[PDB]
């Protein structure tokens, strides 16, 4: 799956149907996947680094592959 | 979904019924959510901003919807 | 409901029913709210004052209400 | 039920049938609660004291019972 | 189960079908252990050497044994 952000954490929300959207570099995106909640605000509240992967790469686009460094 | 409030969390409180009760700002509101209770409570021990979203914006109302600055 | 007990969590017990017991103040209580367990070891982690909330305030009451400040 | 072992956790395990091994002072011990995963794993990194509580008090014994102080 | 590799943990990564990946060593290794990902992504957090076990002890290898110290 294709590179389509870098970057820290700038925000995060959680949603009315339960997903979870997380801004990163330029883009807005959500997931579904309810393990990466925990672990999406711990890479925001660490300053870690984050890299999502998705072909739907642009604003409310969705998401389930991230890498954290 | 309006912005309701917008502030550090002030205190949380958990309830009988297994809701979870947040104060920022001058309210009181509660989520039914699961997933936000250790979420919310992170927020509060690490001092990030929170903007709880509601159209029941008033002391004692529910909300699902957060963001995490 | 009414307080029993304000303080810092002096320490924290797993039981092997899986309730909770906590010791604040000079009581012992127990939860059986599963999702209490990991806020309540956070609290004593960090240091936070906790007010439990009960009507049965002797060593070894019962509570579900708790406030972290 | 008899404490068997108390002192800082010396190193953790997940195991291949999802249960979990702690190394508290001479032995080597584990539980099958999911819920104490985490919670021991804190105490972990965080340097808490903790002492386990099992009649099965011999290496590779089972426990539930443990404070974390 | 041998050990395959001892190290931090270089990344880790969520996949798309919920399985965790980490990078520790030379070795890119992934486990299906829902459990484990809180538990992996706070070993790296915090900078706590880890063991895997495994007999897939190869590039995108599995695992369910880990040693956290
Ligand atoms: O968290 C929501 C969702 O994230 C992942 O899917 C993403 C989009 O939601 C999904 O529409 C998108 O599908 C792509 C196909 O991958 C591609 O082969 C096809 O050509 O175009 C569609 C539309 O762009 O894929 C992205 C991730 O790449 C995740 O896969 C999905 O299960 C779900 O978790
Ligand atoms: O966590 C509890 C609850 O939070 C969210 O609902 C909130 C109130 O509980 C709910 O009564 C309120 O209803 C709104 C309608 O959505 C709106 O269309 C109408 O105009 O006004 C009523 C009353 O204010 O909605 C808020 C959220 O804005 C969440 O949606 C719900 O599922 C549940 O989690
Ligand atoms: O986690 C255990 C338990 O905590 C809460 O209940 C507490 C006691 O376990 C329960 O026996 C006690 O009951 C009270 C009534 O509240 C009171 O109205 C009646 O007059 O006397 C009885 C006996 O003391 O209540 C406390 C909490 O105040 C929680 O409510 C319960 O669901 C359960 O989680
Ligand atoms: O996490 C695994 C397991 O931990 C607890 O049980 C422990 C041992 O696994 C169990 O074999 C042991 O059994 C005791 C009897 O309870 C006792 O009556 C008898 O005298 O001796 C045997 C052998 O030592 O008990 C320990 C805990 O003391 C936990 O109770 C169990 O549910 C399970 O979680
Ligand atoms: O998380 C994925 C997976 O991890 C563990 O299994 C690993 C490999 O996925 C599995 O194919 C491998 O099988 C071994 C046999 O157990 C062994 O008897 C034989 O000699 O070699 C094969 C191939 O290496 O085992 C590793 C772990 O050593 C875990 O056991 C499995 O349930 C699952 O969680
Ligand atoms: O305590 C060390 C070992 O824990 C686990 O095994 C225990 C127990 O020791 C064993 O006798 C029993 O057959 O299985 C238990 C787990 O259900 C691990 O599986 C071992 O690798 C040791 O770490």
Chains 1, 2, 3, 4, 5 share one sequence.
Do not use: W
Not at 13 to 36: M, P, Q, S
Request: hydrophobic letters at 30%.
């Amino acid at each position: 799956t294709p590179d389509c952000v870098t970057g820290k954490v700038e925000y995060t929300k959680y949603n009315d149907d339960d997903t979870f959207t997380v801004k990163v570099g330029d883009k807005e995106l959500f997931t579904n996947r309810a393990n990466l909640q925990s672990l999406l605000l711990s890479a925001q509240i660490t300053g870690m680094t984050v890299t999502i992967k998705t072909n739907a790469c642009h604003n409310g686009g969705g998401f389930s592959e991230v890498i954290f460094r």
